[PDB]
Point group: C2
Chain length 81, copies 2
């Protein structure tokens, strides 16, 4: 499928950012030819809130840099393991 | 452009393989929804022919693994620098 391919690229890109423990949730949708996405990543529970927010920002930068059709990407974090 | 995006992904993927000194040539075309491509990479002139052929095979694996719509990719090598 069309959107399977883009979603697999998003997940892959996110999972390669240091401190990501899996993609918990990804909602990606077409707005014209652009993708708008919302994502939840897992992080180490003992990371600080400041570190988890840095990880989110690094995921946003990595994913947006690799998948050019993404025009909006909201990343938040949840404790995992 | 449509094909600019895929071609930039191909080049980027190739350039991240150890021993690639630039993409010299890339011809990529649609055959239905699949891409068929031919590429020339630069390599160190003092690599052996056996090493250059390993690099080509590594580029083929890397690019094909990252860009799922590619169904044929022919890689050869030319001395660069």
């Amino acid at each position: 499928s069309h959107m399977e391919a883009v979603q697999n690229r998003i997940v892959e890109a996110a999972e390669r950012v240091p401190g990501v423990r899996g993609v918990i949730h990804l909602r990606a949708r077409y707005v014209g030819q652009d993708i708008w996405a919302d994502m939840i990543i897992g992080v180490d529970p003992e990371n600080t809130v400041e570190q988890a927010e840095e990880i989110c920002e690094a995921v946003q930068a990595a994913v947006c840099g690799k998948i050019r059709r993404i025009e909006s990407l909201h990343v938040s974090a949840h404790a995992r393991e």
